[PDB]
Amino acid sequence: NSNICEVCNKWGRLFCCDTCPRSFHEHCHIPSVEANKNPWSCIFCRIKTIQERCPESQSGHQESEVLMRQMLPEEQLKCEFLLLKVYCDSKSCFFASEPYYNREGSQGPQKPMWLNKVKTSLNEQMYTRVEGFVQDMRLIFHNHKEFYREDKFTRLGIQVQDIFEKNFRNIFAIQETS
Ligand SMILES: [Zn+2]
Ligand SMILES: [Zn+2]
Ligand SMILES: [Zn+2]
């Protein structure tokens, strides 16, 4: 198994996947690594199993259909993975914790949002449809773009949004387009 956490790339108290060589800190894995279960399979392995069980699940989909899906266990898992994929990028640190807004010439957003809040919401089963999760994720980056205006710091929002959107298209098998 790897000797660093797959998400944060640090050593420490790691839990090892039994079906692949990845390792995780307890709260880096999403959901948080489970108390018992021997063997244990990580979220990457659980997602791979869904695909393998239903190969046709990788045929192209319309985003509009994906967003209206109810958050049954498999969609719940997919959103947890997609959230985890954003945490995997080091630039997610900027969007992880609760932000504050005091910049000359800008006003803060009406509805602040951040990754740890989305993480809690997923954990507490507060989203009934994929759309709920996706809207909060996109709001993160949209609030950032709006607040930072022409400061070059706006690019961090573009960059992390691009990681989100690419992973969304991959995980939910969105029909490729030009
Ligand atoms: Zn970690
Ligand atoms: Zn694994
Ligand atoms: Zn099938």
PDB file of C-alpha atoms and ligand atoms in Angstrom:
ATOM      1  CA  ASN A   1       0.000   0.000   0.000  1.00  0.00           C
ATOM      2  CA  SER A   2       0.962   3.654  -0.480  1.00  0.00           C
ATOM      3  CA  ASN A   3       2.701   5.366   2.504  1.00  0.00           C
ATOM      4  CA  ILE A   4       0.978   8.700   1.913  1.00  0.00           C
ATOM      5  CA  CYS A   5      -2.727   9.698   1.964  1.00  0.00           C
ATOM      6  CA  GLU A   6      -4.218   9.647  -1.538  1.00  0.00           C
ATOM      7  CA  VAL A   7      -6.084  12.928  -0.941  1.00  0.00           C
ATOM      8  CA  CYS A   8      -3.626  15.187   0.938  1.00  0.00           C
ATOM      9  CA  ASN A   9      -0.339  13.457   0.015  1.00  0.00           C
ATOM     10  CA  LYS A  10       0.925  13.465   3.656  1.00  0.00           C
ATOM     11  CA  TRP A  11       2.008  10.569   5.874  1.00  0.00           C
ATOM     12  CA  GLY A  12       0.393  10.009   9.272  1.00  0.00           C
ATOM     13  CA  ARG A  13      -2.268   7.629  10.674  1.00  0.00           C
ATOM     14  CA  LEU A  14      -3.322   5.933   7.423  1.00  0.00           C
ATOM     15  CA  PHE A  15      -5.960   3.286   6.678  1.00  0.00           C
ATOM     16  CA  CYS A  16      -5.141   1.026   3.801  1.00  0.00           C
ATOM     17  CA  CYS A  17      -7.505  -0.211   1.118  1.00  0.00           C
ATOM     18  CA  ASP A  18      -7.717  -4.018   0.872  1.00  0.00           C
ATOM     19  CA  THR A  19      -8.557  -4.039  -2.843  1.00  0.00           C
ATOM     20  CA  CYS A  20      -6.146  -1.438  -4.133  1.00  0.00           C
ATOM     21  CA  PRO A  21      -2.882   0.081  -2.923  1.00  0.00           C
ATOM     22  CA  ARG A  22      -4.375   3.453  -1.841  1.00  0.00           C
ATOM     23  CA  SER A  23      -4.256   4.787   1.688  1.00  0.00           C
ATOM     24  CA  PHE A  24      -6.166   7.459   3.582  1.00  0.00           C
ATOM     25  CA  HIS A  25      -6.335   9.535   6.648  1.00  0.00           C
ATOM     26  CA  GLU A  26      -9.572   8.879   8.506  1.00  0.00           C
ATOM     27  CA  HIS A  27     -11.314  12.175   7.595  1.00  0.00           C
ATOM     28  CA  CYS A  28      -9.607  12.634   4.208  1.00  0.00           C
ATOM     29  CA  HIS A  29     -11.573   9.631   2.897  1.00  0.00           C
ATOM     30  CA  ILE A  30     -15.230  10.397   2.205  1.00  0.00           C
ATOM     31  CA  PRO A  31     -17.206   8.974   3.850  1.00  0.00           C
ATOM     32  CA  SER A  32     -14.809   8.934   6.904  1.00  0.00           C
ATOM     33  CA  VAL A  33     -13.040   5.579   7.115  1.00  0.00           C
ATOM     34  CA  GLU A  34     -15.398   3.008   8.651  1.00  0.00           C
ATOM     35  CA  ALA A  35     -14.810   1.684  12.273  1.00  0.00           C
ATOM     36  CA  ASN A  36     -14.699  -2.041  11.468  1.00  0.00           C
ATOM     37  CA  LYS A  37     -15.089  -3.899   8.076  1.00  0.00           C
ATOM     38  CA  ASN A  38     -12.209  -6.306   7.338  1.00  0.00           C
ATOM     39  CA  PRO A  39     -11.754  -6.323   4.427  1.00  0.00           C
ATOM     40  CA  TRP A  40     -12.308  -2.606   3.652  1.00  0.00           C
ATOM     41  CA  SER A  41     -12.629  -1.194   0.191  1.00  0.00           C
ATOM     42  CA  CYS A  42     -12.010   2.544  -0.503  1.00  0.00           C
ATOM     43  CA  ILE A  43     -14.323   4.794  -2.494  1.00  0.00           C
ATOM     44  CA  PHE A  44     -12.244   4.435  -5.670  1.00  0.00           C
ATOM     45  CA  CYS A  45     -12.793   0.622  -5.496  1.00  0.00           C
ATOM     46  CA  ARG A  46     -16.518   1.026  -4.664  1.00  0.00           C
ATOM     47  CA  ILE A  47     -16.999   3.305  -7.681  1.00  0.00           C
ATOM     48  CA  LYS A  48     -15.103   0.880  -9.910  1.00  0.00           C
ATOM     49  CA  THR A  49     -17.433  -1.934  -8.788  1.00  0.00           C
ATOM     50  CA  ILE A  50     -20.546   0.046  -9.838  1.00  0.00           C
ATOM     51  CA  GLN A  51     -19.037   0.455 -13.346  1.00  0.00           C
ATOM     52  CA  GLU A  52     -18.015  -3.201 -13.578  1.00  0.00           C
ATOM     53  CA  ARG A  53     -21.434  -4.443 -12.435  1.00  0.00           C
ATOM     54  CA  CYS A  54     -23.184  -2.212 -15.019  1.00  0.00           C
ATOM     55  CA  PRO A  55     -20.817  -1.400 -17.911  1.00  0.00           C
ATOM     56  CA  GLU A  56     -23.631   0.472 -19.694  1.00  0.00           C
ATOM     57  CA  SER A  57     -23.615   3.028 -16.832  1.00  0.00           C
ATOM     58  CA  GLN A  58     -20.655   4.521 -18.774  1.00  0.00           C
ATOM     59  CA  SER A  59     -22.662   5.306 -21.871  1.00  0.00           C
ATOM     60  CA  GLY A  60     -23.248   9.039 -22.329  1.00  0.00           C
ATOM     61  CA  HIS A  61     -25.833  10.925 -20.319  1.00  0.00           C
ATOM     62  CA  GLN A  62     -27.528  14.300 -20.455  1.00  0.00           C
ATOM     63  CA  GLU A  63     -26.580  16.573 -17.554  1.00  0.00           C
ATOM     64  CA  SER A  64     -30.237  17.546 -17.075  1.00  0.00           C
ATOM     65  CA  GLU A  65     -31.213  13.893 -16.478  1.00  0.00           C
ATOM     66  CA  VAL A  66     -28.270  13.387 -14.089  1.00  0.00           C
ATOM     67  CA  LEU A  67     -29.185  16.453 -11.985  1.00  0.00           C
ATOM     68  CA  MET A  68     -32.823  15.222 -11.451  1.00  0.00           C
ATOM     69  CA  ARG A  69     -31.720  11.869 -10.081  1.00  0.00           C
ATOM     70  CA  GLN A  70     -32.738  11.160  -6.545  1.00  0.00           C
ATOM     71  CA  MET A  71     -29.936  10.644  -4.062  1.00  0.00           C
ATOM     72  CA  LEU A  72     -30.208   6.856  -3.737  1.00  0.00           C
ATOM     73  CA  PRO A  73     -27.098   5.032  -2.396  1.00  0.00           C
ATOM     74  CA  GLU A  74     -25.246   4.923  -5.709  1.00  0.00           C
ATOM     75  CA  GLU A  75     -25.765   8.639  -6.468  1.00  0.00           C
ATOM     76  CA  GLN A  76     -24.837   9.469  -2.869  1.00  0.00           C
ATOM     77  CA  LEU A  77     -21.587   7.529  -3.385  1.00  0.00           C
ATOM     78  CA  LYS A  78     -20.877   9.219  -6.701  1.00  0.00           C
ATOM     79  CA  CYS A  79     -21.283  12.685  -5.174  1.00  0.00           C
ATOM     80  CA  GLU A  80     -19.022  11.699  -2.211  1.00  0.00           C
ATOM     81  CA  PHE A  81     -16.358  10.637  -4.722  1.00  0.00           C
ATOM     82  CA  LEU A  82     -16.700  13.760  -6.796  1.00  0.00           C
ATOM     83  CA  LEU A  83     -16.278  15.839  -3.582  1.00  0.00           C
ATOM     84  CA  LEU A  84     -13.244  13.771  -2.715  1.00  0.00           C
ATOM     85  CA  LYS A  85     -11.720  14.405  -6.145  1.00  0.00           C
ATOM     86  CA  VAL A  86     -11.915  18.144  -5.529  1.00  0.00           C
ATOM     87  CA  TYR A  87     -10.213  17.738  -2.098  1.00  0.00           C
ATOM     88  CA  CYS A  88      -7.466  15.826  -3.907  1.00  0.00           C
ATOM     89  CA  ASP A  89      -6.287  19.064  -5.544  1.00  0.00           C
ATOM     90  CA  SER A  90      -4.113  21.186  -3.244  1.00  0.00           C
ATOM     91  CA  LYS A  91      -5.917  24.357  -4.334  1.00  0.00           C
ATOM     92  CA  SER A  92      -9.058  23.053  -2.592  1.00  0.00           C
ATOM     93  CA  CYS A  93      -7.552  24.545   0.622  1.00  0.00           C
ATOM     94  CA  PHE A  94      -8.853  27.943  -0.477  1.00  0.00           C
ATOM     95  CA  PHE A  95     -12.458  26.696  -0.586  1.00  0.00           C
ATOM     96  CA  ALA A  96     -12.466  24.210   2.325  1.00  0.00           C
ATOM     97  CA  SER A  97     -13.388  26.288   5.355  1.00  0.00           C
ATOM     98  CA  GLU A  98     -15.861  29.067   5.944  1.00  0.00           C
ATOM     99  CA  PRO A  99     -14.826  32.202   4.112  1.00  0.00           C
ATOM    100  CA  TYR A 100     -15.195  35.898   5.024  1.00  0.00           C
ATOM    101  CA  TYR A 101     -15.574  38.975   2.907  1.00  0.00           C
ATOM    102  CA  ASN A 102     -14.038  42.386   3.580  1.00  0.00           C
ATOM    103  CA  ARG A 103     -12.490  43.852   0.473  1.00  0.00           C
ATOM    104  CA  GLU A 104     -12.695  47.467  -0.665  1.00  0.00           C
ATOM    105  CA  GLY A 105     -15.097  47.676  -3.617  1.00  0.00           C
ATOM    106  CA  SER A 106     -16.729  44.256  -3.166  1.00  0.00           C
ATOM    107  CA  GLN A 107     -19.669  42.920  -1.293  1.00  0.00           C
ATOM    108  CA  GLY A 108     -19.788  39.350   0.072  1.00  0.00           C
ATOM    109  CA  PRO A 109     -22.146  36.781  -1.535  1.00  0.00           C
ATOM    110  CA  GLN A 110     -25.718  36.384  -0.418  1.00  0.00           C
ATOM    111  CA  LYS A 111     -25.187  32.646   0.127  1.00  0.00           C
ATOM    112  CA  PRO A 112     -21.696  31.719   1.177  1.00  0.00           C
ATOM    113  CA  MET A 113     -20.653  28.106   0.562  1.00  0.00           C
ATOM    114  CA  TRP A 114     -17.554  26.011   1.174  1.00  0.00           C
ATOM    115  CA  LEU A 115     -16.391  22.404   0.781  1.00  0.00           C
ATOM    116  CA  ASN A 116     -16.617  21.399   4.460  1.00  0.00           C
ATOM    117  CA  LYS A 117     -20.216  22.572   4.503  1.00  0.00           C
ATOM    118  CA  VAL A 118     -20.976  20.420   1.456  1.00  0.00           C
ATOM    119  CA  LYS A 119     -19.173  17.567   3.183  1.00  0.00           C
ATOM    120  CA  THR A 120     -21.425  17.883   6.270  1.00  0.00           C
ATOM    121  CA  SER A 121     -24.526  18.235   4.141  1.00  0.00           C
ATOM    122  CA  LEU A 122     -23.713  15.012   2.311  1.00  0.00           C
ATOM    123  CA  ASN A 123     -22.968  13.256   5.613  1.00  0.00           C
ATOM    124  CA  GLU A 124     -26.273  14.401   7.102  1.00  0.00           C
ATOM    125  CA  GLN A 125     -28.183  13.307   3.895  1.00  0.00           C
ATOM    126  CA  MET A 126     -29.474  16.835   3.274  1.00  0.00           C
ATOM    127  CA  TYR A 127     -29.512  16.544  -0.511  1.00  0.00           C
ATOM    128  CA  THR A 128     -32.470  14.718  -2.087  1.00  0.00           C
ATOM    129  CA  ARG A 129     -31.258  15.025  -5.658  1.00  0.00           C
ATOM    130  CA  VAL A 130     -27.893  15.252  -7.381  1.00  0.00           C
ATOM    131  CA  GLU A 131     -28.902  18.780  -8.394  1.00  0.00           C
ATOM    132  CA  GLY A 132     -28.703  19.953  -4.705  1.00  0.00           C
ATOM    133  CA  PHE A 133     -25.063  18.868  -4.420  1.00  0.00           C
ATOM    134  CA  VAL A 134     -24.030  20.191  -7.814  1.00  0.00           C
ATOM    135  CA  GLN A 135     -25.670  23.598  -7.213  1.00  0.00           C
ATOM    136  CA  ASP A 136     -23.791  24.084  -3.878  1.00  0.00           C
ATOM    137  CA  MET A 137     -20.462  22.969  -5.484  1.00  0.00           C
ATOM    138  CA  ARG A 138     -20.872  25.398  -8.387  1.00  0.00           C
ATOM    139  CA  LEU A 139     -21.916  28.203  -6.015  1.00  0.00           C
ATOM    140  CA  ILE A 140     -18.518  27.903  -4.293  1.00  0.00           C
ATOM    141  CA  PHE A 141     -16.685  28.939  -7.407  1.00  0.00           C
ATOM    142  CA  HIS A 142     -19.276  31.369  -8.654  1.00  0.00           C
ATOM    143  CA  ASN A 143     -19.188  33.325  -5.306  1.00  0.00           C
ATOM    144  CA  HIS A 144     -15.374  33.428  -5.614  1.00  0.00           C
ATOM    145  CA  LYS A 145     -15.424  34.788  -9.163  1.00  0.00           C
ATOM    146  CA  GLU A 146     -17.975  37.432  -8.315  1.00  0.00           C
ATOM    147  CA  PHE A 147     -16.170  38.668  -5.171  1.00  0.00           C
ATOM    148  CA  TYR A 148     -12.629  38.779  -6.475  1.00  0.00           C
ATOM    149  CA  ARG A 149     -13.618  40.578  -9.711  1.00  0.00           C
ATOM    150  CA  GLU A 150     -10.452  41.511 -11.612  1.00  0.00           C
ATOM    151  CA  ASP A 151      -7.956  40.387  -8.973  1.00  0.00           C
ATOM    152  CA  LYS A 152      -5.895  37.605 -10.429  1.00  0.00           C
ATOM    153  CA  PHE A 153      -6.914  35.535  -7.386  1.00  0.00           C
ATOM    154  CA  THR A 154     -10.160  34.850  -9.305  1.00  0.00           C
ATOM    155  CA  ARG A 155      -8.193  32.272 -11.284  1.00  0.00           C
ATOM    156  CA  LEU A 156      -8.103  29.906  -8.313  1.00  0.00           C
ATOM    157  CA  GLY A 157     -11.885  29.598  -8.636  1.00  0.00           C
ATOM    158  CA  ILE A 158     -11.603  28.856 -12.346  1.00  0.00           C
ATOM    159  CA  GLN A 159      -8.980  26.249 -11.709  1.00  0.00           C
ATOM    160  CA  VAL A 160     -10.788  24.358  -8.980  1.00  0.00           C
ATOM    161  CA  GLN A 161     -14.072  24.609 -10.904  1.00  0.00           C
ATOM    162  CA  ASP A 162     -12.368  23.002 -13.895  1.00  0.00           C
ATOM    163  CA  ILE A 163     -11.325  20.061 -11.655  1.00  0.00           C
ATOM    164  CA  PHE A 164     -14.888  19.774 -10.370  1.00  0.00           C
ATOM    165  CA  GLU A 165     -16.465  19.886 -13.849  1.00  0.00           C
ATOM    166  CA  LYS A 166     -14.056  17.354 -15.408  1.00  0.00           C
ATOM    167  CA  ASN A 167     -14.635  14.938 -12.583  1.00  0.00           C
ATOM    168  CA  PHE A 168     -18.413  15.496 -12.764  1.00  0.00           C
ATOM    169  CA  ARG A 169     -18.398  14.640 -16.494  1.00  0.00           C
ATOM    170  CA  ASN A 170     -16.240  11.534 -15.824  1.00  0.00           C
ATOM    171  CA  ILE A 171     -18.058  10.161 -12.752  1.00  0.00           C
ATOM    172  CA  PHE A 172     -21.550  10.654 -14.049  1.00  0.00           C
ATOM    173  CA  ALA A 173     -20.607   9.692 -17.626  1.00  0.00           C
ATOM    174  CA  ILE A 174     -21.897  12.894 -19.268  1.00  0.00           C
ATOM    175  CA  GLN A 175     -22.162  12.597 -23.088  1.00  0.00           C
ATOM    176  CA  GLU A 176     -19.008  14.000 -24.672  1.00  0.00           C
ATOM    177  CA  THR A 177     -19.557  17.125 -26.829  1.00  0.00           C
ATOM    178  CA  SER A 178     -17.637  19.785 -28.801  1.00  0.00           C
TER     179      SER A 178
HETATM  180 ZN    ZN B   1      -5.007  12.949   4.098  1.00  0.00          ZN
HETATM  181 ZN    ZN B   2      -9.229   0.886  -3.066  1.00  0.00          ZN
HETATM  182 ZN    ZN B   3     -26.273  -3.187 -16.073  1.00  0.00          ZN
END
